[PDB]
From a paper:
Competitive inhibition in the nM range was observed against ADC-33 (0.057 μM) and in the low μM range (4.4 μM) against OXA-24/40, confirming this compound as a potent inhibitor of class C enzymes and suggesting that the sulfonamidoboronate might be a potential scaffold for cross-class inhibition with the class D enzymes. In its complex with OXA-24/40, CR167 adopts a binding mode that is similar to that of the carbapenem doripenem and extends away from the intact Tyr112/Met223 bridge into a hydrophobic pocket composed of Met114, Tyr112, Met223, and Trp221, referred to as the R2 site. The aromatic ring of the inhibitor is positioned such that it interacts with Tyr112 in an edge-to-face stacking interaction. The centroid–centroid distance between the aryl rings of the inhibitor and Tyr112 is 5.6 Å, with an angle of 89° between the planes of the aryl rings. As expected, the boron atom is covalently attached to the Oγ of the catalytic Ser81. The O1 hydroxyl of the boronic acid is bound in the presumed oxyanion hole, whereas the O2 hydroxyl interacts with Ser128 and a water molecule present in the active site. As in the complex with doripenem, the terminal carboxylate group of CR167 forms a key ionic interaction with the class D carboxylate recognition residue Arg261 and a hydrogen bond with Ser219. From this superposition, we observed that the R2 site is relatively open and offers space for the design and optimization of inhibitors, whereas the region surrounding the C(6)-hydroxyethyl group of carbapenems does not offer much space to expand. In the OXA-24/40 complex, CR167 binds in the R2 region of the active site, forming an essential interaction with its carboxylate recognition residue Arg261, and resembles the carbapenem binding orientation observed in class D enzymes. Despite the overall binding mode difference between the β-lactamase classes, superposition of these three complexes revealed that the carbon α to the boron of CR167 is in the same position as the C(6) atom of doripenem where the hydroxyethyl side chain is attached.
Numbering used by the authors: 32 to 275
The structure:
Amino acid sequence: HISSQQHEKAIKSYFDEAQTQGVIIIKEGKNLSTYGNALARANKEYVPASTFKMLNALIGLENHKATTNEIFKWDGKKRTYPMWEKDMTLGEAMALSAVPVYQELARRTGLELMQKEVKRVNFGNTNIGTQVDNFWLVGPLKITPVQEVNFADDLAHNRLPFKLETQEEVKKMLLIKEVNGSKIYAKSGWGMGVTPQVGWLTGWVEQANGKKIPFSLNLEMKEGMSGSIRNEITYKSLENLGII
Ligand SMILES: *[B]([O])([O])[C][N]S(=O)(=O)[C]C1=[C][C]=[C]C(C([O])=O)=[C]1
């Protein structure tokens, strides 16, 4: 067995080498562990960015604003990324992190119902303000990494206050990787309309044996960083800890 000094040093080095600052929080049962090169980030608020898609989708499905097979049609207007210029389900929009689709869903839900559901879930600071289509991108909604891993822990275990079927539909949308009989469920986030920019990967490992290990990586993205650094640092960290 590797010392935890070694674990903490190895995981800190993954952040150091990506030349960023960040934290990965791992929950094992009820025990939270904080790793990385900027531990104090663990209890600081950031916009949830596209991590909010998880709750956005729970809210919309529970409230019959969409079904899992409905196709959100591209309206033909130029999008920020050409990959978004196509027709997609909530599932496909989740994988592509297609903001316009999740904005449409937010608009269907409406400000009033959205506010009620976010308070009911008590997600982050629970504050959505007045614009139903961008509160998760630029504020006022904010959340700590500890809160994000706890949200992930809830979803993984079907503990959120939504039907089981709602939760299962959403979890099916989040499978991003399989590694030696482990499945990684997670949602990326990248908040580019805040400064500094925040990057997220929040989810859980479902191990071969049934155990679900939640995690939230939170870091600072800067210009010319690749998105996949969030993934790379996560996988390296989970492997270093023998979680995958
Ligand atoms: B959300 O935070 O992922 C949306 N962020 S974005 O629209 O500013 C840029 C973007 C596009 C596609 C994928 C990502 C990502 O986070 O994986 C981000």
